[PDB]
Amino acid sequence: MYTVGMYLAERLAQIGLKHHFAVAGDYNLVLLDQLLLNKDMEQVYCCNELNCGFSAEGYARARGAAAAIVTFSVGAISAMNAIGGAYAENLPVILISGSPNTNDYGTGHILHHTIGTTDYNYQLEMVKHVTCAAESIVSAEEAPAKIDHVIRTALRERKPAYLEIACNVAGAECVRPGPINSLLRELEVDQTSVTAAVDAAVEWLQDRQNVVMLVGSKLRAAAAEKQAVALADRLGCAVTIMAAAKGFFPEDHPNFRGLYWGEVSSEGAQELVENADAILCLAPVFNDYATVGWNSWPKGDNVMVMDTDRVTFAGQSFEGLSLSTFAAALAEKAPSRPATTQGTQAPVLGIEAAEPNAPLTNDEMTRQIQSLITSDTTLTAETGDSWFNASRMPIPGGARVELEMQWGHIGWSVPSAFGNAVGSPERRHIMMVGDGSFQLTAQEVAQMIRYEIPVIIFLINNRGYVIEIAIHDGPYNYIKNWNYAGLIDVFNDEDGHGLGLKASTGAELEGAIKKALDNRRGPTLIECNIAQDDCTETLIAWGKRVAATNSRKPQ
Amino acid sequence: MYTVGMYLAERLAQIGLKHHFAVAGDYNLVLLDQLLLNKDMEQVYCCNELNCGFSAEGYARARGAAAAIVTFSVGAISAMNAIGGAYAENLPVILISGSPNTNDYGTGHILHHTIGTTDYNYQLEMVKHVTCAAESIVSAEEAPAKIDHVIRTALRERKPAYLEIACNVAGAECVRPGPINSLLRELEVDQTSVTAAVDAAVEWLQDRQNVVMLVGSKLRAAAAEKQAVALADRLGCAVTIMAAAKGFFPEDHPNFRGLYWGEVSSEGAQELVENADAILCLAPVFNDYATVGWNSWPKGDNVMVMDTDRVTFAGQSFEGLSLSTFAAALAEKAPSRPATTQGTQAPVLGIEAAEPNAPLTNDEMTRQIQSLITSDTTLTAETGDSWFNASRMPIPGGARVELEMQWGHIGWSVPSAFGNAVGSPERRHIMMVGDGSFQLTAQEVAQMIRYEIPVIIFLINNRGYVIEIAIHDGPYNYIKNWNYAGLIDVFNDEDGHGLGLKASTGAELEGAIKKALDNRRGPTLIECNIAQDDCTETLIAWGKRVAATNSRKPQ
Amino acid sequence: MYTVGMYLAERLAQIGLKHHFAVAGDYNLVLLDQLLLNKDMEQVYCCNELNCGFSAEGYARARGAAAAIVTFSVGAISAMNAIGGAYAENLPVILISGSPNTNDYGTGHILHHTIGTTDYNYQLEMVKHVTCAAESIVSAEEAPAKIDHVIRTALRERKPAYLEIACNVAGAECVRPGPINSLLRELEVDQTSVTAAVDAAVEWLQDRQNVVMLVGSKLRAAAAEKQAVALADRLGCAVTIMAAAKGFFPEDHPNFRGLYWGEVSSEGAQELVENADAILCLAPVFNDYATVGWNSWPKGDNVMVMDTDRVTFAGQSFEGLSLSTFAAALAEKAPSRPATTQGTQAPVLGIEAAEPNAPLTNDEMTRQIQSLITSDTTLTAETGDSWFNASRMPIPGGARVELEMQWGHIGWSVPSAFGNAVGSPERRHIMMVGDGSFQLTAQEVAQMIRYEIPVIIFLINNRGYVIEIAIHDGPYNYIKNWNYAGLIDVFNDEDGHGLGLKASTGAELEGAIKKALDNRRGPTLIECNIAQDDCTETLIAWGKRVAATNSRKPQ
Ligand SMILES: Cc1ncc(C[n+]2csc(CCOP(=O)(O)OP(=O)(O)O)c2C)c(N)n1
Ligand SMILES: Cc1ncc(C[n+]2csc(CCOP(=O)(O)OP(=O)(O)O)c2C)c(N)n1
Ligand SMILES: Cc1ncc(C[n+]2csc(CCOP(=O)(O)OP(=O)(O)O)c2C)c(N)n1
Ligand SMILES: [Mg+2]
Ligand SMILES: [Mg+2]
Ligand SMILES: [Mg+2]
């Protein structure tokens, strides 16, 4: 007996998934059983569906795709928040939901876990707004076409997708999937467009001596990181990153000149980019946060925007190509433009160590975290002042930084780091999460414990929502303090090997970090006591610009 | 300076809210400031937006309405789950989201907390599927009409509604709201219909000696609890409840004859209902869980269905009336029909006290919890075996029992008990939650601690999803155990006055209950060690019927 | 045998429908049979579903409600345009669609008249955007509730609504509807609010001497025509209408002072409104066309806006009332304010009779049409220069003018007049329609002929889209000329009593009108030869303002 659920599981295995995330409910139990029969995947359980969804999202940052299985409505609607986040962050997460028995359609039956009307279609209609494809299976006959359609579309678009499978069809006899080379099939490229684009680009660079590359947060989605390097080596020009693009270009590189983020840029990088004769933007996302409230937005005659399927410059826009293909072809023909590398250098941390027994500062915490980042390290940085600490940390080549600056859902980091570490266990896994963020999703630390995932968690306990205080202060920014370190042994109970530690000084942090490195059978949470008043100066400047922009009057 | 947010606050206070629930975010901060200016309300903060929504939902069970305020997308989509919950359970919860600055509409700008496209309307489009009204405010001029339409429709339909307010409109100058008697305005009743319905009902009851009232879960939504009592008193007939209707009819009543729930009914009640010549159903919801998988569903010649706005019986349907006005009018003219009360008795708990040092049983735990329920007690019972324990407990008249049997989102109980206790602090608040459920929403116990809410939480630690085991067993039912009692110390830190206790015997439970009653400055969690095998026999019988119905094969 | 379709037919009869409109399709044939069994209604067939929908719309203008019955998708989507129009113009039209057999739900079957996917819900999801209620019926048991919900909501909201009925459920056995007084039940009014609103309104009028009523296009939707007269009688002030409100206030009232429409107002009416101390706006719609491109929009301190459910003035807004109840209560307490009636005059047509043999002018045509308008005449005026001719015609009390100025769908007038004449056959029915408009819907004249409906059609053959030429000229405004008068013979064939006549002079028009008045057994089309450049001066002035407003550059 080969079933619909096995077809799904076999295709998920062919994507490269070694795991999928689940929360059981009576609409998906038979489905979950079919997925357990597949030998190439482990079925990982989560506390709640918001966390399950974000676990899949993190797994997708490790493996290029992921799958989250939930129950109808009560499960799926919370997961839709994580799916919207996958869409925002350009990740192929597949959300599969159990759905009502086929015999209930066209009857007028009221069903459990619904709003209590005869419409069972509302979940599909809701989820279409946060997915690139969305299908519902009510027969075994139609399942192959729909399963494959959602997976193929997700992988090609780099966007999440949705399936629902009727609870009484997940175990129904289904045809077997045929063999494949890859489930990712790109669109065929138009060589006329690439050629005309390259030649136009070469002509445009002729009278432009000061050239800067600006790397954007869609570069990984374009699968063009290597072609970005190739291009950079032939131009020999300065390379900068947008905040959300950290780790998508090696900061090791001899021509790297730091972070462009308007008035909160690395030293020199603002005037570098803003005075350049040619700015080559590689897959940028110029949203209100990245532009510091619409103040720092490169555009005009001096800008070339290289999106994932398009390049635009000099009054022209060339389409039917990929960033991968255009960057590779332009690399062949690009002239030397080294001027912007001369009389500049890669930015440094600029934090000399603190007196080891003094109260722990933000700079000092940032310094020790930075020293932990190897070339086999993944650092997950939460929305909060962690964006601004992570943004000023130099990293070695091969190191991966995970940011969620488009969606910006606080608490993302805990289940994301869990999913990421499950998907790339060979790497060292670090995360920086604020106290506020941590409270939304804290319970997934228990699943890190259950599955023995050695994430090192730097909890910044600054007694509130500090980034919100820098935008607009009020009573809503002040939260109930927990003993975050002591939470670990509650989640351990009898079995677990999590470790909960405290650090109120440089010397205490140093010692906690040693014990964290040695703890291999579970996570280690280092509660860092940082003063509420002790945040980055970059956060305070950005926050003021964001507050002004959000509050600007109507017309 | 009178503002849009102030207009909203004033109307919310006019509904009778003394609290509203919020999670801050930059899209709603200015709105939160305006709501804070209102003298008649306190602003209660939550850990996450899912919990914030269920806290409002619990508050609405106490006060008849509630408000949750969230930020765009990252907040709102989680809260949509709880709003779907509010729809399912017929509760006027208003969800208010902060939304984008008016100046970004029609520009093409990409905004933080969005999926990254130019569509800002997608949240409104999603939330329409789980609300009775949903509006978007982008000007102070239109705000009054949209605020009032949302609030009025919610209250009248007994369904949740949605508002989004542009972050730069919340503090814009607005006209003042006029004085009101009540924002609940009902539809005019059609007396021609009432009269004909009553006259037809009297004629239908002429040759029907065995009459039984079956009280349903929409009776509170109909605002017809008193009229139900008047009708029972006049008929003098037997009165039963459906599982979801507990506390909507007084179990004190001399003519009460227990729970009707198919094969898992109280003693006698199945035979009583199913053999009656007339069954008067008052506001039923005959879903798949309530009918035990379509096996126990009263319909046909012997059945009268009284919906909130309609009566159906004897091949006729009468509308333009309300359950309240029809029940009253029928009580005036109803014949005496006492035959079903003669010789029978109201059902008894029937649990003998255990030996005080024997390992704690489900029965013994149920016995001690049942003794805590007074006429001023609210018992919130979670989806789990707590549904079946709660449904076999007799309660005194005036006792309130909260079940979420249509939506059935595990974890609902914790934030719902929180909001309900905040809304009715004069009452004693008891909570029955399973270990599995507790893990989804655990963190809101920290808000009970923050706001000093003396909920007594009976945590049933049976080491997994036991109700899911009764449907279909597999590895997905077994969760990571926590030290649930010890979690209270973590949430307390230095501030709090919550108490965490364990009970493994009848005597240990007794002492923990006594310390629970004496703790007025915070919640008391009592972790009860119940065996995984030791669940009610009703759960097992009901579980098998549900599995067989859910799994029935396609056509 | 009492069926679902009979329940529907009986509820439609109870609203006051003596007709419903249909286009047969295999999905609705059985439903159409059920409807035909109803003794109180005739079933009227239309050429196409756009026309069917607009025929219902016109019927609703006569009788307050209407019904159009169509087939799935191929029928319903065209009808949605008319439904959109009904929403725009505040008319309770019920669109009923046949839909798929219930056994196809949850199967994956591909069905005829669909887009060819397994989704059959897409029609319902589309129509929700242009309706106040939308329900799908897949069982006889649920049919009564859904039928009554859509009808009651439509009548109370004064908006259209949607039903779909499965093609195998329309003939299914149903319970019978109970007797009613009226299917229109209003919301109970809040006396506290009315009292405060009237008392603040009186106080506000006490301090303001020059008062002017401005009658708006939602006054009929408010059902407040008579209360408006009472208010005008107690106030004794000048009364003006907005263009779309023509006929909603009697123009031979001694205090009527004409049309307010910015710079295209009738003589003296612009100054009268714009220099007033108080402007009482009774149910206005201030769209871009009504305000002459936002140049003439009364607002601010001298303005009181009475909506259908709200009153707003002097920094306050009162709700929980109706325009009907509020204006009646204000009519008993308001002060006398006659100053704006003194000196001024009710405006006249001001067109001298042309020399009878001179080429027909726009003025001469307008003069002769104005003469036909009696107290029991209904004039349907199409989008085009007819808007501007109708708006400069004085009409006696009781006369009705139908304009579609919110939706503005050219061609609406032909099927609208047809439905209106079917619904109000005791009246004289006149139509003004342009050549361009007529071409979209000309075939419904054949239905006028079929059903012997004596509409007098004045077809203005100005050879193109003259209103669009005044906005912005180009080749898209010039259309193929037809022999419009000769079309009547084609539709007559050997059977009908339509008359088609040409008028190129005042004498020929006079002769044609006399023949039109004598033709009782069918419509009379009078094709009037009007020069392309002979359009009203008001159209030119208005056209320029609209063009400038639409083209205004982005920011
Ligand atoms: C789900 C969600 N809710 C609310 C917000 C709004 N928000 C953004 S940053 C922030 C504060 C984060 O606090 P913390 O985690 O303590 O970081 P800190 O700024 O203190 O370092 C909030 C409440 C959000 N982005 N996502
Ligand atoms: C959000 C959500 N996810 C999943 C489910 C499916 N579900 C129903 S009962 C249940 C088990 C609850 O277990 P517990 O709280 O331990 O109570 P017990 O049955 O053990 O008494 C689950 C996972 C649900 N109802 N809601
Ligand atoms: C369905 C539809 N299509 C197009 C338009 C745009 N439009 C508005 S007025 C008009 C011209 C109408 O021409 P005619 O009926 O001859 O009247 P005239 O302007 O000549 O008086 C057009 C095409 C519309 N309102 N509705
Ligand atoms: Mg913080
Ligand atoms: Mg359990
Ligand atoms: Mg024309």
Author numbering:
A (entry chain A), B (entry chain B), C (entry chain C): 1 to 555
Reported in the publication:
ZpPDC forms a tetramer from four identical subunits in a dimer-of-dimers fashion. Each monomer contains a pyrimidine-binding (PYR) domain, a regulatory (R) domain and a pyrophosphate-binding (PP) domain. The TPP molecules bind across both subunits in each dimer, with the pyrophosphate group binding to the PP domain from one subunit and the pyrimidine ring binding to the PYR domain from the second subunit, thus forming two active sites in the dimer.
In this study, we present the crystal structure of recombinant ZpPDC at 2.15 Å resolution together with a comparison to the other known bacterial PDCs, thereby increasing the structural information available on these rare enzymes. However, six 1,2-ethanediol (EDO) molecules (the PEG monomer) are present, four of which can be found in the active sites in chains I, N, Q and R. Through pseudo-222 symmetry, the four monomers in a tetramer create four cofactor- and substrate-binding sites located in narrow clefts on the interfaces between the PYR domain of one monomer and the PP domain of a second monomer. The TPP molecule binds as indicated by the domain nomenclature, with the pyrophosphate group binding to the PP domain of one monomer and the pyrimidine ring binding to the PYR domain of a second monomer in the dimer. The pyrophosphate group of TPP is anchored to the protein by a Mg2+ ion. It forms an octahedral coordination sphere with the two O atoms on the diphosphate group of the TPP, the side-chain O atoms of Asp435 and Asn462, the main-chain O atom of Gly464 and a water molecule. Glu468 and Tyr289 from one monomer and Asp26, His112 and His113 from a second monomer interact with EDO through an extensive hydrogen-bond network.
